[PDB]
Design an enzyme around this catalytic site. Structure first.
Site, PDB file in Angstrom:
ATOM      1  CE  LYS C  44      -3.584   0.662   3.148  1.00  0.00           C
ATOM      2  NZ  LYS C  44      -4.718   0.071   3.909  1.00  0.00           N
ATOM      3  CG  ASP C 157      -2.532  -8.267  11.893  1.00  0.00           C
ATOM      4  OD1 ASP C 157      -3.691  -8.732  11.926  1.00  0.00           O
ATOM      5  OD2 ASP C 157      -2.107  -7.555  10.960  1.00  0.00           O
ATOM      6  CD  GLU C 161      -3.334 -13.128   5.407  1.00  0.00           C
ATOM      7  OE1 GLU C 161      -4.116 -12.176   5.606  1.00  0.00           O
ATOM      8  OE2 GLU C 161      -3.492 -14.258   5.916  1.00  0.00           O
TER       9      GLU C 161
HETATM   10  N1  LIG Z   1      11.655  -9.251   4.662  1.00  0.00           N
HETATM   11  C1  LIG Z   1      11.194  -9.793   3.510  1.00  0.00           C
HETATM   12  N2  LIG Z   1      11.895 -10.749   2.860  1.00  0.00           N
HETATM   13  C2  LIG Z   1      11.447 -11.294   1.712  1.00  0.00           C
HETATM   14  N3  LIG Z   1      10.288 -10.949   1.119  1.00  0.00           N
HETATM   15  C3  LIG Z   1       9.483 -10.003   1.663  1.00  0.00           C
HETATM   16  C4  LIG Z   1       9.907  -9.360   2.918  1.00  0.00           C
HETATM   17  N4  LIG Z   1       8.951  -8.472   3.242  1.00  0.00           N
HETATM   18  C5  LIG Z   1       7.998  -8.538   2.281  1.00  0.00           C
HETATM   19  N5  LIG Z   1       8.309  -9.447   1.337  1.00  0.00           N
HETATM   20  C6  LIG Z   1       7.464  -9.747   0.154  1.00  0.00           C
HETATM   21  O1  LIG Z   1       6.983  -8.502  -0.361  1.00  0.00           O
HETATM   22  C7  LIG Z   1       5.556  -8.415  -0.275  1.00  0.00           C
HETATM   23  C8  LIG Z   1       5.120  -7.093   0.348  1.00  0.00           C
HETATM   24  O2  LIG Z   1       4.849  -7.343   1.728  1.00  0.00           O
HETATM   25  P1  LIG Z   1       4.547  -6.177   2.799  1.00  0.00           P
HETATM   26  O3  LIG Z   1       5.040  -4.860   2.247  1.00  0.00           O
HETATM   27  O4  LIG Z   1       5.097  -6.651   4.123  1.00  0.00           O
HETATM   28  O5  LIG Z   1       2.937  -6.170   2.921  1.00  0.00           O
HETATM   29  P2  LIG Z   1       2.103  -4.893   3.449  1.00  0.00           P
HETATM   30  O6  LIG Z   1       2.626  -3.716   2.660  1.00  0.00           O
HETATM   31  O7  LIG Z   1       0.672  -5.250   3.126  1.00  0.00           O
HETATM   32  O8  LIG Z   1       2.410  -4.839   4.927  1.00  0.00           O
HETATM   33  C9  LIG Z   1       5.091  -9.584   0.577  1.00  0.00           C
HETATM   34  O9  LIG Z   1       3.930 -10.195   0.008  1.00  0.00           O
HETATM   35  C10 LIG Z   1       6.253 -10.553   0.595  1.00  0.00           C
HETATM   36  O10 LIG Z   1       5.994 -11.599  -0.346  1.00  0.00           O
END
Ligand SMILES: Nc1ncnc2c1ncn2[C@@H]1O[C@H](COP(=O)(O)OP(=O)(O)O)[C@@H](O)[C@H]1O
Ligand SMILES: Nc1ncnc2c1ncn2[C@@H]1O[C@H](COP(=O)(O)OP(=O)(O)O)[C@@H](O)[C@H]1O
Ligand SMILES: Nc1ncnc2c1ncn2[C@@H]1O[C@H](COP(=O)(O)OP(=O)(O)O)[C@@H](O)[C@H]1O
Lengths: 270, 267, 282
Positions: C44, C157, C161
């Site tokens: 987002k 939470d 996910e």
């Molecule tokens: N520390 C990480 N290491 C590897 N992949 C990640 C990591 N954080 C997020 N991702 C990938 O990037 C995507 C974005 O996740 P994230 O930004 O945490 O979700 P949100 O913005 O809804 O909180 C996730 O679906 C995940 O697959």
């Protein structure tokens, strides 16, 4: 794994900072509008009757002044209401056609309601008959079920926030308004609108709300006690619906659907 | 019957309906969360007061700027002999200043730490002053979320002063959304009870080692009186510590309670 | 008597204390410290990139959030809170926030890289987990959660996910956006009406743990319905049914976890040495 170093890299982030588009609502400015006489004056600005210069479409332009929005700190509250009312299309809900802003001003492009508020109608007609009242309640319940379907609860329903279209139809204007894993203690509402609907039906038939007092404390007292009386001319169905709606326990309050099924409503609604 | 291509600008114009050098600075009176308090005097009127400096950096860190504006709005339009007076405020870059009444005898918390307990005269007098300030507050439609010995200061005559103010359309609203605000002033009443207890015993009546234990005790009104807590004090505190808010006394009933009447040095 | 001081010597006193007040230490990170690789995902508020620290060549994740959307959504202090929480939190089953920094338009989170993605992904792939993977996930989660509670942190939470996977497939708690700082300010002066239905404890997590266990073995959470109303009703009545294939030890742990009365729910160490968990986990 391949990594970019410095420039080629610093450009990656600033490229994706702009592929972060979010400019997907029609763009607008003040020059697209002729301004007419003021429709009203408010806490944060003024409403003017306006016209889109191109289409000649008559509408309302609400100008809010960002100065006194930063004072009371309601900016994000306003973003909430605006995002809500933009994605909401229903004949009994006043349309937010769009919005824009400069500095010190935010403009709301709104549907024009030529027959004013239901509050003014109540002030001038003293009281409504059962046809007008049941029709207002039907349109209200329609807009409210549409609202509850969109997960939005409007719980500031009142004659000042109910406008009237060209055909005299009622239109809701104000909108000041994890699960599958949440435990019971963190998840224990819509029935509030059913109460407000009962209050509104009573006020439409009688001329004043059932708990009005000259002091606010007396009104606390009456609301908590559900203390009110019907005058003679309130009918039995009317009495029945209003009494069902004004139940102290929210889970004993009917469903908007039942309101739309109520015999008095069906018989008197136009 | 209209047109354009100025008006709003006009309608806007219409809608648009202290300095540090004015003070001599004294010794520091205390340093806290967002800044420091200094003793001060008005250079012109020779009037003693306290100058609270909050630093805008940490104010914006903790995200409390609007909360602070609300605090000041409430406290400034409030004058009572048992409420610390906010004379005014001003600001420069990196600093907001609160011009406040000076309380020379410090906090009730420090006094309670020094003495462990207060006698019944001092305690009933504190409760009288608190109830007066609280009835004035409720009359000006203000409820103080949390009175407690750290937020109570002391004037020259040792009189109580409420200092902090932390978390300080019906006719269509249903009962479930009214009782709350309808019995909301009773919150303070409960706190009063607690305070009275802590004034006499030395610690509050629901103190525990874990917060869940304290929640359980508060929800069940589980507390005991030590021996030396007298008859009328037990009566007053038990009246005040009622689980159902409407069963709690009025402030004017507290001010007329026999124990308070007998032991208080103030009207 | 009191002494009062006018002029420069007075204001310098306040100024001095200003300087002494500044008491906030953190390492000064910058974008120049990072080589950026392929994107790992979108969000987002920005993008996650596979990144590398210039000197160490150490591989990590760089989450870039754009202040514009943070300001629009009014989530700035929520983000500051979750960053403060996740920074002062080090456990092998908690995704590591190495650090954070910002420039106008951007705040960057320097995070532990999880190469095997979310548990949500793998539950999509396999539809259901066997009792060994499930019990192992629950063990790692209970370890991370007991560490969280001991440092006075209630995650709120727990869900597939928010669970990431390391190179060895070990679980990592990732999103602390609803996480909270547990009490202990005081409640000593709060009345019952202002803490009964408005203030919880760590047992929240225990409940979620139960849910998660169920969802690991069955494929969907136990109170799944169409709209909030139904799911809310089922949660408040704790109305759920096991499929026939759920073994009895798993039924016992999930039924113990999903108790309406919070302090009736087990404690994490009871989960960790529940017989089903012991039999099916490493
Ligand atoms: N520390 C990480 N290491 C590897 N992949 C990640 C990591 N954080 C997020 N991702 C990938 O990037 C995507 C974005 O996740 P994230 O930004 O945490 O979700 P949100 O913005 O809804 O909180 C996730 O679906 C995940 O697959
Ligand atoms: N879209 C509209 N069409 C017609 N009249 C309007 C419209 N919006 C506002 N008004 C008039 O302006 C008055 C004040 O409205 P406003 O201050 O904008 O909202 P609020 O209901 O929050 O006070 C209303 O009583 C109404 O008579
Ligand atoms: N108006 C005042 N008069 C006398 N002392 C004060 C005043 N305001 C604060 N203090 C001193 O400062 C300390 C409390 O600081 P304060 O800034 O009120 O707390 P916080 O920063 O936690 O709100 C107390 O020890 C008290 O003695």
């Amino acid at each position: 794994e391949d990594f970019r170093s410095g420039s080629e890299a610093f450009d990656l982030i600033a490229q994706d900072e702009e592929e972060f588009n979010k400019s997907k609502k029609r763009q607008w400015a003040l020059e697209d509008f002729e301004i007419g006489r003021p429709l009203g004056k408010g806490k944060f600005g003024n409403v003017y009757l306006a016209r889109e210069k191109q289409s000649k479409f008559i509408l309302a332009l609400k100008v809010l002044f960002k100065a006194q929005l930063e004072k009371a700190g309601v900016e994000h509250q306003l973003r909430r209401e605006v995002e809500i009312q933009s994605h909401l299309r229903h004949p009994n809900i006043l349309r937010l056609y769009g919005y824009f802003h400069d500095a010190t001003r935010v403009y709301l492009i709104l549907e024009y309601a030529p027959l004013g508020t239901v509050y003014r109608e109540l002030q001038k007609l003293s009281k409504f008959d059962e046809q007008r009242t049941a029709t207002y309640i039907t349109e209200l319940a329609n807009a409210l079920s549409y609202c509850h379907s969109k997960r939005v609860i409007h719980r500031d329903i009142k004659p000042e926030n109910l406008l009237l279209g060209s055909a005299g139809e009622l239109k809701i204007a104000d909108f000041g308004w994890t699960l599958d894993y949440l435990p019971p203690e963190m998840i224990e509402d819509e029935k509030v609108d059913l109460w407000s609907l009962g209050v509104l039906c009573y006020e439409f038939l009688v001329g004043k709300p059932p708990f009005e007092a000259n002091t606010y404390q007396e009104t606390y007292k009456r609301i908590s006690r559900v203390e009110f009386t019907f005058p003679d001319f309130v009918t039995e169905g009317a009495r029945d619906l209003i009494s069902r709606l004004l139940k102290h326990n929210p889970s004993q309050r009917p469903m908007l659907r039942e309101v739309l099924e109520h015999p008095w409503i069906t018989a008197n609604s136009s």
